[PDB]
Design a protein around this ligand. Structure first.
Ligand SMILES: *[C@@H]1O[C@H](CO)[C@@H](O[C@@H]2O[C@H](CO)[C@@H](O[C@@H]3O[C@H](CO[C@H]4O[C@H](CO)[C@@H](O)[C@H](O[C@H]5O[C@H](CO)[C@@H](O)[C@H](O)[C@@H]5O[C@H]5O[C@H](CO)[C@@H](O)[C@H](O)[C@@H]5O)[C@@H]4O)[C@@H](O)[C@H](O)[C@@H]3O)[C@H](O)[C@H]2NC(C)=O)[C@H](O)[C@H]1NC(C)=O
Ligand code: Y6R
Ligand code: CA
Ligand code: CA
Ligand code: CL
Ligand code: CL
Ligand code: ZN
Length: 804
């Protein structure tokens, strides 16, 4: 029940929310069906349209018009946005040359430059170029303001997850909105676009911008708009608010457009029918910019033009059906579309085995347009596992395709030519960012960045302290003219030990043997220098990584590589080495094939043993620094130290060996040398953060040797490739991956072929930001360079995507 007997008289679009049973007059009243009887009459006026005409100039004020052209309209703050052009001979904002806004030019009583978020749904990145001819206002913002070529959304590239990430700086796994449709097993409730469940606050975690603003005494206009409120009324309402008295006027505003998404689904991303919605958005932007110019605010307000995701060509006939794969199709629930999520149909079924489901969906058709994953096995860059609303089984769907359960679901539940939701590295899914105003830079192009970073920036633009989020604060300082946040390196928590030679061979009982007895004052003093770290400025090019948690570890120096060896985890946390362009690949000589040597710097008690690997029939081992890249036959013996060794499934060894033997050399040739840092990751609880010692779920049988869930490498070189990696004077270039450490190669359908047909493709899929590895290891890289910290944070958030 709601007693909607009150009035909206003088309450049109009120900023405080009144409670039951009194009727409401805010921009959300409709969605709650709680509006006052006269809401439409008083607040949603349409009479005479949205533009002033020549005859209307200096008219008498009729209060039933949608906007006014009367003399007192500027005072009342409700002129039609084109009033000054038609009636006062002023120019449109678009027709003015753009002049740099060096200082905020704000009216009196304005404590800070206001922020207006102009969000556009499904606004694919490539529209900025391909529609430029029909979007003159947007093109002005772009060329005069600060813009990226594109901005990367979060996965899934859906509306609700992405709009709420924009508002929170959080991954969906963290804010809780993991899809447009969700089932929470603890609530036993479903979230849908249609229905009232989506309104309960229990679905929405994190702290969105408008809550952050309020808690810190910065007033917010209501972000969300009802579908039946025309865009013109949305602009006027925002311009009205900007006319409110100082003590009432919000500092942050949001506008939202359901276009071009709406048309995109119908007509595809580039349908000839797409020109008009693009024309319209631009006109809406023109109205805001003209309106701001009236209020003398067009050189005071910061405007963000931002999209949630792009749009892909998708049709009914491009649907994969699970019924073509499974026998028991009725014992599963599927969340369908541009992504698949599978769970049991009955919540407590004993004989439900996701293993057989996965197996039934794996490389079963030569042409398969999706791939099944256990969620912990999804690429770590997606950050899509750590929420109870994310089903254990996931299907990553090929761009342009859909997955459905049965054919009846598609024909009894084609009308559409467009859709979105795919892997967030997909080109068609990229969306837009433009910043314009006093605080943004002037005519500045920035590199592409991820939408998780904007919350920090919007907090900065408003003088707010951001809630804890997934952005890297300071990585987008280069978008801004004036920065309110100076980022600083975190302090190292653990300092390393620097052990010398302390143990004799016979003290070790590791079950390891090596044929190393085959054997001068000059070259014996030379190799001592190597163990002292004489060649360390060659193999450790950016300083030692800092350990940001409490642990016990040793720095080990060698001729060819340096390592941070953990006495807790019995293996290195990191291994650092430089491979120059000139460097050569050799093989493991025949006598050294099974060679594992004790490390006389490290105690038997803090070492791995070979016996455990002998007994554990599932688990073999590999080496972090590759024997194949030793600089001399004598230095190769270093690669076989027990302290360079890590547990590896034979299946994974195929991937790793190809990386170490072939790919590193290829990268060094293409990039003019590379520095490589490699190591283990332990994330058994799939939360994207390093596991503590007491959270390890797997050991090499009958040992205390923990098995990594993943192996990473960070591969750095000079951005100016005319310079070698180890003598770089400028900006850096980086690519990284986090490989899942899996007992099989079921992910790569071509794995029975030679490693050259599949391994690199798998690595590309598991591309990663340096920052992802940091979360997962508790380490902090690039501590010693000649580059500014902001530039280094930008470098750390970089993702090499491999898209063309
Ligand atoms: C991305 O950035 C976020 C934010 O910094 C990081 O997430 C934080 O991680 C830490 C460490 O694991 C968590 O702290 C622990 O949690 C609890 C306290 O938790 C409560 O209090 C906070 C503070 O107000 C609140 O945000 C939490 O809200 C969670 O739970 C709600 C339901 O109960 C839910 O509506 C909401 O979405 C959120 O759920 C998410 O986090 C929980 C874990 O807390 C997780 O189970 C779930 O799947 C969701 O992902 C909650 O009421 C303490 O008792 C512990 O001691 C410990 O300190 C933070 O809670 C957590 N913050 C948020 C907002 O999630 C991510 O780690 C980071 N990711 C990466 C990859 O870097
Ligand atoms: O009013 C807002 C935004 C406020 C905002 C504005 C800015 C913003 O960013 C921030 F926070 F940073 F300012 C966040 C939210 N709405 C957006 C949310 C939903 C989306 N929706 C759909 O029907 C819909 C659209 C596309 C689809 N494709 N497939 N299914 C789809 C379903 C109904 C509702 C409209 C209201
Ligand atoms: Ca959307
Ligand atoms: Ca973890
Ligand atoms: Cl294999
Ligand atoms: Cl630990
Ligand atoms: Zn959509």
């Amino acid at each position: 029940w709601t007693a909607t007997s009150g009035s909206c008289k003088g309450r049109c679009f009120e900023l405080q929310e009144v409670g039951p049973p009194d009727c409401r007059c805010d921009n959300l009243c409709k969605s709650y069906s709680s509006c006052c009887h006269d809401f439409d009459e008083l607040c949603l006026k349409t009479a005479r349209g949205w533009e002033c005409t020549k005859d209307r100039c200096g008219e008498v004020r009729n209060e039933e018009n949608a906007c006014h052209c009367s003399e007192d309209c500027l005072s009342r703050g409700d002129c039609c946005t084109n009033y000054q052009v038609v009636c006062k001979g002023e120019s449109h904002w678009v027709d003015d040359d753009c002049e740099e806004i060096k200082v905020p030019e704000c009216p009196a009583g304005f404590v800070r430059p206001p922020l207006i978020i102009f969000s556009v749904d499904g606004f694919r990145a490539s529209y900025m170029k391909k529609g430029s001819k029909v979007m003159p206002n947007i093109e002005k913002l772009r060329s005069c303001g600060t813009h990226a070529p594109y901005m990367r959304p979060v996965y899934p590239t859906k509306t609700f997850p992405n709009l709420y990430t924009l508002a929170t700086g959080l991954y969906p796994e963290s804010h809780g909105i993991v899809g447009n449709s969700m089932y929470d097993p603890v609530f036993d409730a479903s979230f849908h676009l249609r229905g009232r469940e989506k309104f309960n606050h229990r679905w929405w975690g994190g702290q969105p911008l408008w809550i952050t603003a309020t808690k810190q005494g910065v007033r917010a206009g209501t972000f969300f708009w009802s579908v039946s409120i025309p865009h013109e009324r949305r602009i006027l309402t925002i311009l009205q608010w900007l006319s409110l008295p100082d003590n009432e006027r919000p500092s942050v505003y949001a506008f939202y457009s359901e276009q071009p998404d709406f048309s995109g689904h119908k007509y595809g991303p580039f349908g000839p029918e797409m020109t008009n919605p693009l024309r319209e958005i631009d006109k809406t932007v023109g109205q805001l910019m003209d309106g701001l110019k009236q209020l003398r605010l067009h050189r005071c307000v910061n405007v963000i033009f931002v999209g949630d995701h792009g749009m892909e060509d998708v049709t009914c006939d491009r649907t994969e059906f699970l019924s073509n794969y499974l026998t028991n199709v009725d014992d599963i629930t599927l969340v369908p579309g541009t992504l698949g999520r599978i769970r049991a149909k009955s919540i407590n079924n004993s004989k439900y085995d996701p293993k057989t489901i996965i197996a039934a969906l794996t490389c079963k058709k030569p042409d398969q347009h999706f791939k099944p994953y256990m969620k912990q096995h999804l690429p770590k860059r997606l950050h899509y596992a750590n929420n109870r609303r994310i089903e254990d089984i996931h299907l990553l769907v090929d761009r342009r395709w859909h997955v459905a359960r049965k054919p009846l679901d598609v024909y009894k539940k084609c009308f559409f030519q467009g859709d979105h939701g795919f892997d967030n590295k997909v080109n068609s899914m990229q969306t837009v960012f433009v910043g314009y105003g006093p605080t943004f830079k002037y005519r500045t192009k920035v590199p592409p960045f991820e939408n998780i970073e904007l919350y920090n920036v919007m907090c900065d633009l408003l003088g707010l302290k951001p809630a804890p989020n997934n952005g890297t604060h300071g990585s987008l300082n280069h978008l801004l003219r004036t920065n309110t946040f100076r980022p600083t390196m975190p302090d190292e928590v653990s300092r390393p030990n620097y052990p010398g030679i302390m143990y004799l061979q016979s003290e070790f009982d590791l079950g390891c043997t090596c044929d190393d007895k085959v054997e001068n004052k000059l070259e014996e003093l030379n190799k001592r220098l190597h163990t002292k770290g004489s060649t360390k400025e060659r193999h450790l090019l950016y300083g030692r990584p800092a350990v940001l948690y409490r642990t016990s570890y040793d720095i080990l120096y060698h001729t060819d590589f340096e390592s941070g060896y953990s006495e807790i985890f019995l293996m290195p946390l990191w291994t650092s080495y430089t491979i120059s362009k000139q460097a050569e690949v050799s093989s493991i000589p025949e006598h050294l094939t099974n060679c594992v040597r004790p490390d006389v710097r490290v105690s038997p008690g803090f070492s791995q043993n070979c016996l455990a690997y002998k007994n554990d029939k599932q688990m073999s081992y590999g080496f972090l620094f590759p024997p194949y890249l030793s600089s001399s036959p004598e230095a190769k013996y270093d690669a076989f130290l027990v302290t360079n060794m890590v547990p590896m499934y034979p299946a994974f060894k195929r991937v790793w060996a190809y990386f170490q033997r072939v790919l590193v050399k290829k990268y060094a040739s293409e990039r003019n040398g590379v520095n490589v840092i490699s190591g283990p990751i332990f994330d058994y609880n799939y939360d994207g953060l390093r596991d503590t010692e007491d959270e390890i779920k797997q050991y090499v049988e009958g040992s205390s040797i923990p098995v990594p869930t993943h192996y990473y490498s960070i591969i750095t070189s000079c951005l100016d490739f005319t310079q070698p990696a180890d003598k770089c004077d400028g900006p850096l270039s980086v690519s990284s991956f986090i490989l899942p450490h899996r007992p099989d190669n079921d992910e790569s359908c071509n794995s029975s072929e030679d490693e050259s047909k599949w391994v690199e493709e798998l690595m590309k899929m598991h591309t990663a930001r340096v920052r992802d590895i940091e979360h997962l290891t508790g380490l902090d890289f690039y501590r010693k360079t000649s580059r500014s910290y902001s530039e280094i944070l930008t470098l750390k958030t970089y993702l090499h995507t491999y898209e063309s």
